[PDB]
Design a protein around this ligand. Sequence first.
Ligand SMILES: [Cl-]
Ligand SMILES: [Cl-]
Lengths: 184, 184
Amino acid sequence: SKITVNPESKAVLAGQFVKLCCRATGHPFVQYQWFKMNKEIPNGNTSELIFNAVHVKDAGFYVCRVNNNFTFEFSQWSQLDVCDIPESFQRSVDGVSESKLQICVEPTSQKLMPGSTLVLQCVAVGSPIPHYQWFKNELPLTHETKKLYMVPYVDLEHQGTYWCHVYNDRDSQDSKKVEIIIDE
Amino acid sequence: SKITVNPESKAVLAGQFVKLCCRATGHPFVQYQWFKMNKEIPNGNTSELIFNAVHVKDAGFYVCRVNNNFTFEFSQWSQLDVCDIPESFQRSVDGVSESKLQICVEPTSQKLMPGSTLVLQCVAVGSPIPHYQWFKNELPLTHETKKLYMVPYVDLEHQGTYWCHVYNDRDSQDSKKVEIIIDE
Ligand SMILES: [Cl-]
Ligand SMILES: [Cl-]
């Protein structure tokens, strides 16, 4: 029959306790079957899909099929993103995944020389899944929408103040504004 | 602002004309930006994302972000599946993708010997995306939910009548019931 609760797309750290939920109107008098894409997850025949301690391997797209005698309904797709980061960044994050949007890894300030690789990282967790947008000197970096902002070979033109805008539709958080100096 | 039309997950053949749609309440007085996962699709700044002649490379997960001055809303994820099949199976399918659920590639009847590889194929197109479930002698084959049903090395026990149940939530279509003989 019809679905009351659809699963949320979310970003979590590896090792954390994570659930994905699907609840029908007929609950508990319906059948549930979870899928990671077209793979029928074995023993994922319950309302909520539980990863006791997520692994990066677990990241991907999930859907839940709910049936009731005659019908069949597929839930919305849920994207599970699993980030592997050192313990040193897991401050203010326990072994249970929480929905709150929060930056775990912040960008860094660097003095590089022309020809260096510039690597900028911003890792956040939250539900709904966080989105990224990198900025340089108050302007958004066209198409820079990942945790990583990388420049293979820097010119002097790459100098400036950088930050990442992390956001969903419940919250947003700008990362530290970092300074990238390019000289010799 | 709020979203009126969310994109549907769909399966299409390569070369076909395909659209993905997102429409907000504020239309046409809003901004649209499409994404293939976290990649900001360039020039996908319109209500509908158009693939004039899809390529397999195009398959994947898409979302549309709609903003209106203050707000931001992400649509539901859409799964685009692109199947590459010979022209000989494209009968009753033109160069424009249609929503109707229909089997293009059917399983085949075979007389194999113990140790053979048994390959069973069932390819369908439709919107919402079709789902598969293989059956043997009236019983569903536990966890066989892909276009392909493959057995690397057949025993005599693999003999029987097979078919694929293709389905979404608007329609379903059973494939030809095929006979698999295992002898010598
Ligand atoms: Cl959930
Ligand atoms: Cl659509």
